[PDB]
Amino acid sequence: KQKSIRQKLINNVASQAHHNIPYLRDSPFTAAAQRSVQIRSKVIV
Amino acid sequence: NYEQEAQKLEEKALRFLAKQTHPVIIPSFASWFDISKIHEIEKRSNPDFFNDSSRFKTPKAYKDTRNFIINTYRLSPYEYLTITAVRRNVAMDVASIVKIHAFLEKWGLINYQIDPRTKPSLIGPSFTGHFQVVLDTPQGLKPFLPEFPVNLTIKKNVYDSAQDFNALQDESRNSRQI
Amino acid sequence: EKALRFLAKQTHPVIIPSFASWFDISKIHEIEKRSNPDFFNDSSRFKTPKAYKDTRNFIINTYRLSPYEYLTITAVRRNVAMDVASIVKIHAFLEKWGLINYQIDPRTKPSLIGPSFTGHFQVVLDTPQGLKPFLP
Amino acid sequence: ENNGNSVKKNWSDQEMLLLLEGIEMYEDQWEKIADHVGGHKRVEDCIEKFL
Amino acid sequence: PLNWVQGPAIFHMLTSPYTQDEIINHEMNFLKGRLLELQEIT
Amino acid sequence: NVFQSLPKETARGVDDLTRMEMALLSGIPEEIKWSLKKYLTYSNKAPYMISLRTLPDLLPLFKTFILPLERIVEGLNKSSICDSKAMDSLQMGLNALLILRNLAQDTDSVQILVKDREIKSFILFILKKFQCVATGDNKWQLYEGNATFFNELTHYTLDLMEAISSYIAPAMKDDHYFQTLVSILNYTKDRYMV
Amino acid sequence: TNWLYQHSAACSRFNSDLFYDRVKVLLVDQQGLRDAYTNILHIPESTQSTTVLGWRRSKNDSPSDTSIVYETVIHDNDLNKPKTGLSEIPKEIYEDVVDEDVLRAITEQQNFEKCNEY
Amino acid sequence: NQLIPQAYISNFHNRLTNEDDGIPIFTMGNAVLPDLQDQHHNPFNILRYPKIRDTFINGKVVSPYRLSGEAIMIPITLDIEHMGHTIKDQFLWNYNDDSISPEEFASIYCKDLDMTSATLQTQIANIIKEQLKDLENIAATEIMSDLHVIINLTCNLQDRFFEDNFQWNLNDKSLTPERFATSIVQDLGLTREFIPLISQSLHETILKIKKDWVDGHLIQDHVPNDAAFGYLSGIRSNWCPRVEIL
Amino acid sequence: LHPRETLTHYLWSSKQNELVLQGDQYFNEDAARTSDIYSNNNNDRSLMGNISLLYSQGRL
User: Further notes on this entry (chain F)?
Assistant: First the structure.
């Protein structure tokens, strides 16, 4: 039971990992990937 | 003589301290504000006091009426402070005091409509540390001494967690153990 | 001619700070001439310098008669027939250089009635995901 | 016992036993665990002690 | 003139990958499960 | 009895849109990061909420982040980004540039961006520096370590130039946009950019 | 004669009379007041510590602890030299002064007053 | 849980009509407030104070109202009877500023009184428009030539009449009269409500005197009476302030 | 050409990339089955502080 609580803890703390930890959400490549996933598709005409 | 005068000053300073019974909530974006000094956001939103245009609008009178509004709000936090209650006590023209009141209500420093029972709590900064605010000596409670840099902790207070820091519980729960 | 007796009889002794050693009880000089020059450069018929001499002597000696109380602006205005706009200037001038409100009982100074000071109060933040404390 | 124990984060064997009794009872519902411990402990500390 | 309105359902997925091909199925499921829930309001 | 008739709509604090609009207007940098992330999410998922036609006092709030990026592009020919304080301004500027790129596929959030006579100066500046890269001139040779800072900087500007060009429909003779893009087209190897 | 001493003694008696009036009503009789417009106890400002200085950090003794210690403190430098403000004077005035150690005492008092922070 | 919400109480009009609080707006331990006494962190303790369960029992819930080179100060009186109760007060106004209209100040000032009758606003704004437009080029003067007039001054506040005498130079602009009234009320130990009410009773007298320098242009700068200590050497002051209860 | 503001760049960015590579060491097999994450690691502070949040969201 504490194994199944530790899974729900770690797979919801490590599952974000780029919005809480400061030195990871300030790197170039993480910020560029999070910026580049949000690109809205181009409207033709 | 110095120990007795220090204990006397500590006693008659705890006599005048305005002990807190109510928590005060400000919004997170208005954490730039400090009671002591004037921030640059206030100097570009209300420029009429700092341009030295008129004689009746100095930064000293601005800071006095600003501290007046915020101190008469935080001693009674549950009560919506109004303009007419402030206008009868402070001597300024009406347009400027309405500007300052609308400014302080814009940032949520006064009159912040919230019900904190429907929001969780967090632990943002570190747990431990002797956080001690450093005030000044209130000139008027200084010793007479007819002819000494003594600092004095007035109020010690411990908190087990942030959940009892947010609700002003000082481990008095040993009294009410449920 | 009139103030010699008055300084002789009932004046408590002189206490003066070290940065007021340039002071002259007899006459005036360039510091008071350049600080508030309105008593000298013909501002009005009223503001002749001899009245300035008499008022500064009256203020400093009125503090000599009671060195342990704050000499207020109203208590000297009772018997000084001068502009209040210049009584304020001379009083703030003499208090500013630490002469006539220097060593007093500190609970004698008038303070404006007002609410309490809330700086040591605890503030909590309205973070968009909680209510973390405000600890810098 | 029934008396209020000492200053918190001591976790006497009575409280550990009642916590494990609660976890065998309810399998969830940490309010119903924290009152069964005795009600003088929060949910956010019973979970921090079972982990 | 104010109108206190409920905002749109923004798909904030629990795990957030970065490549597009690991997203499109979940976003199709969100579009179906939002437009079907919203179609009955009309 | 008085604590029973509370309005339910305002008992959570302020609403999130005024929260985002006030967070940028302050100077707290982490709250600015939060506000730009949420503006980006609302610009991708529901752009009509941040339509510039509806909220007019919002475009200078992005100009105050985008306009100091020109100094960074000027200094980007050397290893300028040294501490962790200039880089945060760089990332905020690129993220606000992406927000204005995403709002520019609406045809009602676009005319406000066109009538501004200062966003086009930024577009022309970025295109002139990319022409200096694409021709190979000795003035302003690109430092390679900043290249990933510059590359996605020039994909977000062309998508503005692809959207506002219909409103620059009178083409002059000695134009700088047309000359710059016809210089760029000879150099690149991207299918999307061509 | 007997004019100027009489006037100055009347001034000093009027001063002490105003002090004995203002000290009984505010602080001694009921220790404050009550504003009618807002339910706030007005108090004289002299007992209130107008400014606020810097913060101080520390750590608790035992490691791996979770307790928060929030507290207050007072502070002053030497508590005997008064605050007769010479810093509200531009530095061009007192340079035709008579002495040099007078200038040293003015700069010493001003550097004392600019140490309001710690 | 167990936390008070931060707002939603505006018990101000009942203290306006309390008849114990000496507010002149309407007509029709041993401490009183715990601003120096701790309560050991139970809010329920604040219900022992008799003026504070008054603001929880008789309170209501309010909704928040939402919104040049030289200032010219003009005092404005306000005296309106309305359904038995009256409104008698006074406030300054900046003529050079126009950031707020008198309609908006009438809508704000009627909201704290909890009237919102939609016709008090028009009447208040018309009185303010009248007293502003009557005094547009009498307070914009540039007085020189050293008038130095004597001033007797009175103030009415609930049978506690203030009265004093002083010599005034209305040629220099160094002394703000609000700072003057601050210096008075610091010394006499009065409440803070006398801070506006003296200065608002002074500017009017300033534009009463200014009036005679401009309208009739009567100079009459002839012997402001003194006591032979200051300006005019008679033999080598006037009075002192007081608070009389009638 | 200018060596100062590239050596400061090196000392900054090497430190930041070392912290980024050492952002993942407490998610192993036998570093999580043991107890040296939850107990006594208030030095770390990263997890076991989310438990005031994650229970309030119903995840558990």
Answer: Present with 2610 molecules/cell in log phase SD medium.
